[PDB]
Amino acid sequence: MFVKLKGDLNGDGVINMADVMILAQSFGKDGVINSDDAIILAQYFGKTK
């Protein structure tokens, strides 16, 4: 959709654990997705459009 909040990985308009689980699913697969990305994601945790 038009609105793409920073950290909204599944495009539903809200930042919650389902988004963090998408980071999680890719963990171990700045060029990588790891625990530094989670810290940023947590800044946005709870935001809604």
Binding site: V14, N16, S35
Partner: protein, 171 residues
């Protein structure tokens, strides 16, 4: 088959006293993580950070239980709305592939412990200590609860009952 459930240490409380809500998962297969939205009554209760021994801020993480304690990049998330009585927090094993590979799934146990301080005499009829229910960032969830497995799948909301906390009473 599975449940989210809770328990308190005492249901008769005086102003000034603290009541701890332990929250468990029960038979959530290959549990990897949860998020809760928990509404409480701000006239009577105040969430209390028992680790720092002070009031919650909007980023405060409740006390841990026994699950999600392993070294699989276990990570917290919290953003409350304290003025409105809504706790919003969760924890997960971020390194899912390593957790999965451990062959040591968790499924049953305490995941968090949320303490409330009684700041006004509890009404004689009792109050519900808290309620699991969707805040605005869990609009897709059922009853304020999301659970996940070690594949990073949302553990389906028809696979488990959320058992709401009961009542507390004045001493």
């Amino acid at each position: 088959s599975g449940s989210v459930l809770t328990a308190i240490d005492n249901d008769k409380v005086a102003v000034g006293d603290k009541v701890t809500l332990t929250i468990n998962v029960d038979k959530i297969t290959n549990f990897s993580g949860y998020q809760f939205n928990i509404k409480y009554n701000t006239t009577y209760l105040q969430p209390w950070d028992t680790i720092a021994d002070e009031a919650y801020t909007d980023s405060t993480m409740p006390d841990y239980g026994t699950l999600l304690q392993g070294r699989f990049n276990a990570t917290d998330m919290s953003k409350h709305n304290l003025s409105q009585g809504v706790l919003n927090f969760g924890r997960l094993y971020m390194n899912l592939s390593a957790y999965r590979a451990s062959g040591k799934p968790e499924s049953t146990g305490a995941v968090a412990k949320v303490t409330f301080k009684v700041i006004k005499e509890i009404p004689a009829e009792g109050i519900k200590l808290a309620t699991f229910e969707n805040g605005s960032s869990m609009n897709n969830a059922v009853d304020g609860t999301m659970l996940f497995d070690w594949d990073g799948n949302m553990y389906s909301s028809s696979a488990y009952k959320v058992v709401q906390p009961g009542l507390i009473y004045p001493k």
